[PDB]
Homo-oligomer: A and B are copies of this chain.
Amino acid sequence: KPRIGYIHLSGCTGDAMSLTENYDILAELLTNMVDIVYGQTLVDLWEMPEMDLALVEGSVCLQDEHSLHELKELREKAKLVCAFGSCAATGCFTRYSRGGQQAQPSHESFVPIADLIDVDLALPGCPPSPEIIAKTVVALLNNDMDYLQPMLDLAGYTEACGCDLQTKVVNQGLCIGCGTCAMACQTRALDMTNGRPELNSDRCIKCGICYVQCPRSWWPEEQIKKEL
């Protein structure tokens, strides 16, 4: 019954695919668990209804008149606006773009939606793992925010280098060389030279998963409840 809305401004669309990944949940889930409205991909109504939460796949583009126009509309329409996938949350690979590729050589600038409009929560990943996306939906559906405390916090996150866990953590002297953050690389750009993480930029999309998954970056004592 709760209405979930997902609008993909400019996204590889992996994020949507990840959503379909949680198969066991999925077949029932659209039907029973959640109501999906105003998804151009998943539905065909052109103008958005008020929606309990809005999921925005991709970083907005300043130049495109429509994307900007749509984003402004979205804030009123969605009681809660959540940006998911790095491309909405951090701007992701988009940042590397320098415009000037035809057609439309002009479109060169893309920014995380978050900068344009306050966003309640963004969960990043390229795409976000299907499970996290399912866990949030059940959480959002089941209305618990102890769980989503980390994400509400993550909405702020925006720019994120691979480079940054080095500035954000290893520099702080926080890093203990556990290796968790390298494992959380979709790109596989990060790897551990003894024993700290060393990453090679040629291959980093700035998704931000490594800053997020370091135990050091923020420790929830929420989980302890989950195991036991």
Contacts and interface: CB of A to CB of B under 8 A. Distances in A.
Interface of A: 62-63, 91, 95-96, 98, 100, 108-111, 159, 161, 163, 166-167, 170-173, 193-194, 196, 198, 201-202
A95 B167 contact: yes
If over half of A's interface residues share one DSSP class (helix, strand or loop), that class is named, otherwise mixed; here it is loop
A167 B173 contact: no
20 contacts: A63-B173, A95-B166, A95-B167, A95-B171, A98-B170, A100-B194, A108-B170, A108-B171, A108-B196, A109-B170, A109-B173, A110-B171, A111-B171, A111-B172, A159-B167, A161-B161, A161-B163, A163-B163, A163-B201, A201-B201
A198 B163 contact: no
A91 B164 CA distance: 13
The listed residue with most B CB atoms (<10 A of its CB), out of A63, A110, A161, is A161
Contact of A171 (B109, B171, B198): B109
A107 B24 CA distance: 50
> 9 closest A-B pairs (Cβ-Cβ)?
A201-B201, A109-B173, A98-B196, A109-B171, A159-B167, A62-B173, A95-B167, A98-B170, A161-B163
A163 B199 CA distance: 15
